[PDB]
Design a protein around this ligand. Structure first.
Ligand SMILES: CC(C)[C@H]1CC[C@H](C)C[C@H]1OC(=O)C[n+]1c(COc2ccccc2)n(C)c2ccccc21
Ligand SMILES: [Cl-]
Ligand SMILES: [Cl-]
Ligand SMILES: [Cl-]
Ligand SMILES: [Cl-]
Ligand SMILES: [Cl-]
Ligand code: NA
Lengths: 191, 189
């Protein structure tokens, strides 16, 4: 049994993320993908939206898919979110599943540089998903089958662009599910 | 009043097309957009799916949007489409609207090359849409048309058909109803 673990802040989630999870599930024959919204990033950058907003947008976006679910392990843990804690928690909850941790390739590079990965690679296989656009030699240096990079055209859609459109009152329709568009608007998330 | 005319083969329609139409409508303050599935393209290539399938997928995809609708005028005319016929038909149906014709930059290049572009520019404002990344340059230089980049057009009909052929999932690249219509009609097997 194989379980995908889609980590991110999901601020907001959009169709790029959903396509990514669907394609990774297909490529690696995953039985389910669990979306795990981050609790509080250690990574330097923008202040993220309140955790319950990012959780609810992720539930709304994934509800209709019988093979997707959403986990609160990172939001409920307390303190900053580390990938190794996420995988430990999910390994305990799903003891017989091989874990496939999936996130944006850039984000994954930062995790590996800052946190290291010998312990991470013992816990899960890793998949970095990248927007359309020497690194192979580097990938050959890594443990066999430990890390795969996958290009997803739909990741031309970005959370940054979605937030900027919302701030500028430009339409979000068809970049993300209807329910997420309306949740963003009626809770006034990105003004 | 301003009306967008979104021409395409829509084989299949996908979220890239819907984002593009929505973005053009916002940029140009269009009151509505009419999608017009075309006949067989002028350019030599694959035979597109039967017109009824492409029309139904476009209706399914746009039904929920109050500002979108679908027109049969090009598929009922028969043959490859002259854009001046499309614009004459839509002008008669919306005679007080200024028309904005939008299509893929590649289709627009074929229009400029094989159809009478001088007559065409009297009839509508032309907008080409493309994903980020030559006679068309002469008209752009004169501001006889405008090109708009749409990131979601990284999603392409070619990739959607290849995925269907290989039994790979189409979820979230296009509305659920289109995914299921493609599957249960076996369109790209
Ligand atoms: C840890 C690095 C050396 C290494 C991990 C395995 C992947 C093949 C990534 C590699 O990173 C890079 O190559 C460059 N890089 C990126 C760019 O991240 C990617 C990711 C995938 C493909 C290309 C670039 N970001 C965001 C970094 C942050 C800190 C240090 C180096 C970083
Ligand atoms: Cl993103
Ligand atoms: Cl609510
Ligand atoms: Cl009118
Ligand atoms: Cl002509
Ligand atoms: Cl049917
Ligand atoms: Na122009």
């Amino acid at each position: 049994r194989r379980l995908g673990v889609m980590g991110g802040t999901f601020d907001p989630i959009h169709y790029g993320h959903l396509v990514a999870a669907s394609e990774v599930a297909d490529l690696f024959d995953l039985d389910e993908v669990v979306f795990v919204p981050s609790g509080q990033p250690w990574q330097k950058g923008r202040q993220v939206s309140a955790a319950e907003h990012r959780y609810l947008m992720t539930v709304i976006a994934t509800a209709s898919n019988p093979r997707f679910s959403v986990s609160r392990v990172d939001i409920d843990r307390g303190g900053p979110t580390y990938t190794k804690d996420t995988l430990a928690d999910l390994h305990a909850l799903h003891p017989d599943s091989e874990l496939y941790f999936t996130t944006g390739a850039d984000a994954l590079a930062s995790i590996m540089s800052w946190q290291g990965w010998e312990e991470l690679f013992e816990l899960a296989r890793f998949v970095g998903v990248s927007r359309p656009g020497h690194i192979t030699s580097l990938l050959g240096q890594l443990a066999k089958d430990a890390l795969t990079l996958v290009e997803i055209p739909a990741l031309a859609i970005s959370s940054t662009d979605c937030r900027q459109r919302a701030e500028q009152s430009r339409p979000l329709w068809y970049l993300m599910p209807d329910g997420v568009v309306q949740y963003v608007s009626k809770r006034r998330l990105y003004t």
